Design an enzyme around this catalytic site. Structure first.
Site, PDB file in Angstrom:
ATOM      1  CG  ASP A   1      30.689  16.572  69.614  1.00 42.41           C
ATOM      2  OD1 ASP A   1      31.787  17.136  69.434  1.00 42.41           O
ATOM      3  OD2 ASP A   1      30.518  15.697  70.490  1.00 42.41           O
TER       4      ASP A   1
ATOM      5  CE1 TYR B   1      34.520  12.624  75.607  1.00 40.96           C
ATOM      6  CE2 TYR B   1      33.863  10.710  74.321  1.00 40.96           C
ATOM      7  CZ  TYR B   1      34.727  11.764  74.543  1.00 40.96           C
ATOM      8  OH  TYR B   1      35.798  11.945  73.698  1.00 40.96           O
TER       9      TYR B   1
ATOM     10  NE  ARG C   1      40.201  23.386  67.226  1.00 39.28           N
ATOM     11  CZ  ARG C   1      40.587  22.973  68.431  1.00 39.28           C
ATOM     12  NH1 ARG C   1      40.641  23.830  69.440  1.00 39.28           N
ATOM     13  NH2 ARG C   1      40.919  21.703  68.624  1.00 39.28           N
TER      14      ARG C   1
ATOM     15  NE  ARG D   1      36.087  15.154  64.799  1.00 40.26           N
ATOM     16  CZ  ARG D   1      36.296  15.498  66.067  1.00 40.26           C
ATOM     17  NH1 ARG D   1      36.897  16.644  66.357  1.00 40.26           N
ATOM     18  NH2 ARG D   1      35.906  14.692  67.047  1.00 40.26           N
TER      19      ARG D   1
ATOM     20  NE  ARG E   1      33.710  27.719  67.961  1.00 36.16           N
ATOM     21  CZ  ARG E   1      33.320  28.525  68.941  1.00 36.16           C
ATOM     22  NH1 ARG E   1      32.618  29.614  68.664  1.00 36.16           N
ATOM     23  NH2 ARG E   1      33.630  28.238  70.198  1.00 36.16           N
TER      24      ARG E   1
HETATM   25 CL   LIG Z   1      35.050  13.071  61.157  1.00 36.91          CL
END
Ligand SMILES: [Cl-]
Ligand SMILES: [Cl-]
Ligand SMILES: [Mg+2]
Lengths: 354, 353
Positions: free
Chosen positions: B73, B150, B29, B25, B38
């Site tokens: 994602d 999920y 953010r 990641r 974003r």
């Molecule tokens: Cl990642």
């Protein structure tokens, strides 16, 4: 005690069959729990309701041939008694009105006087002990210092433990001071429970599995070791066995042995057979069935439990194992299913024991 | 041509000049420039190739990282399968439709990855071009088990009630779901390779929830099947594959049988014992707790040195890629990963010369 096989197994003494109890065996999956619960008040007042506490503790014993009862209470009694103001936010779980963030916050914490401050817990222990009539032993319990610290620093439940881990890495001497305060609090609490009638002790290190491996030793394990060193070893001519349980701590069995615990709890991710060979009779083991196994058919549960006992007794040992789930019974379990679990453990044990 | 390929070499247990590093990641953010980009996007992010490419490059401008990872994602696949992905504020990803029955599984469509997920492939190719050979590009997918949780729960889950119920009450149905997902992931990953991915990571983010035998049956074996179906090489280079099951440290020996070149580790696993266990049969990636970055500069440097000490204690001079044990959090100060990266590169001289 008419039945003490639970205590014998934890102490690696000869047993007639495998003992079993279940984490959260008193809970919502039981219709009588919900019925009793509806007559009670707010969720916070349940633990302080000694009548309620004793009643729901006894309920699973009427349905299932369990080999132990556990005090119905909450680990969060200690931080509430320390003045942080526990409340419940529907539906986000436990929260506190105050958080601990600074050196002075930690210094300002009061000393726990468990017998007085948490008298309602001791009344529950003594009342339950009376109601049990010596049928099975009573387990007392506490959260670990690390696990309690997370609630006090985050101010409630947490998925990442942002503020507690920030304190650990940025202000380690502050977290150590908090952990030390909590270790002394837990010693007072557990010893008071023993005085009130508890015959075995479990330390729930519910969030210790979040820690990096060295930090687990420094900021969780060493404080559980300190607690055990401070506990009464015996009462009424009997050893009081201590169980340490860090869910998600299966890689850390060897460090866990150094706590001085009599037994270690395991979850379903740890192979029971290799855990048994690894500890090599140095501690007893408790666990480790996934509660979701109980979502299967009666036949599938029977098969799964037999396989677990095969793992437990593959190495030829004839004691040192207590069957249990690897976490609490879920609210969704069919109340018929834990009976299959209990009866299979007791009956199938004859393959290996005696 | 790659101007820097030490990441690929380390995954393949080939000699390297210093320890490679990237961060899960690393586009996210915690970067103010991510938040700005974003705010101009308003899922749309992942499907906006321009946005996706831009945020992928941002951490590389800031840190001397040894790899880029596709910004996307894992839930692209179940979205493409028609379950209706959306995001609830403060609750995470959700699906309008769930998979609960044998008929639900049978109704899942066949994925045409290059078309149904064309926006992912366009991101891969656009990023590959924009990188201009600076560092290798990682492509990725969720594992079949992790995707299944999920699809069955309908979003994030603490207990995995419905997926584990299916596993124990209807295992044949879960197996059919997992098999469909394995085939989908093979096609998805091979399409990413065709589009320019130079390494592959399989994220089994919730495999650690499984009981140990069920990990093998319902997660590991499906990752093994995926890897057996992947293109092994492209453009004269091997394409290394990383398997990462967070919480799977007790299962390293079984994990080797996936056929992966490398295994990811989280912070609960001692790197030294992991290195001894795998004994040079796979590379290892990990394993710093991102919360370490909440400490002082001096403490980060100390912690990272200790991690490399663990990695190299056995005298083994390759097969290690430094990384976090999970995604960097949104709370990390952007100054801090530079200390991580630079310490990894510099301190490695103690062991690698
Ligand atoms: Cl990642
Ligand atoms: Cl319990
Ligand atoms: Mg089909």
């Amino acid at each position: 005690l008419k039945n003490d096989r639970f205590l014998r197994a934890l102490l690696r003494e000869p047993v007639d069959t495998t003992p079993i109890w279940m984490m959260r065996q008193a809970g919502r999956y039981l219709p009588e729990y919900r019925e009793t619960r509806s007559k009670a008040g707010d969720f916070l007042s349940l633990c302080k309701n000694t009548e309620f506490a004793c009643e729901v503790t006894l309920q699973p014993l009427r349905r299932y041939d369990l080999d132990a009862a556990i005090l119905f209470s909450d680990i969060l009694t200690i931080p509430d008694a320390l003045g942080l103001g526990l409340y419940f936010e529907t539906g986000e779980g436990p929260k506190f009105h105050k958080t601990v963030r600074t050196e002075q916050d930690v210094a300002n914490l009061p000393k726990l006087n468990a017998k007085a401050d948490l008298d309602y817990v001791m009344n529950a222990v003594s009342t339950i002990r009376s109601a049990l009539g010596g049928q099975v032993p009573l387990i007392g319990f506490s959260g670990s210092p690390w696990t309690l610290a997370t609630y006090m620093v985050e101010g409630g439940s947490s998925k990442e433990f942002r503020f507690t881990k920030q304190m650990m890495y940025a202000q380690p001497e502050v977290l150590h001071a908090l952990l030390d305060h909590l270790a002394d609090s837990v010693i007072d609490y557990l010893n008071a429970q023993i005085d009130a009638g508890a015959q075995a002790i479990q330390i729930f290190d519910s969030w210790g599995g979040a820690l990096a491996h060295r930090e687990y030793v420094e900021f969780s394990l060493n404080y559980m070791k300190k607690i055990i060193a401070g506990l009464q070893r015996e009462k009424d001519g009997r050893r009081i066995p201590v169980i340490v349980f860090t869910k998600g701590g299966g890689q850390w069995l060897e460090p866990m042995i150094t706590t001085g615990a009599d037994a270690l709890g395991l979850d379903w991710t740890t192979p029971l057979n290799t855990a048994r060979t690894t500890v090599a009779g140095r501690v007893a083991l408790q666990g480790n069935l996934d509660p979701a196994v109980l979502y299967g058919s009666a036949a599938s549960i029977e098969k799964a439990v037999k396989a677990m006992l095969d793992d437990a007794y593959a190495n030829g040992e004839k004691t040192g194992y207590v069957a249990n789930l690897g976490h609490g019974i879920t609210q969704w379990v069919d109340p018929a299913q834990p009976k299959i679990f209990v009866d299979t453990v007791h009956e199938y044990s004859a393959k290996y024991l005696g």
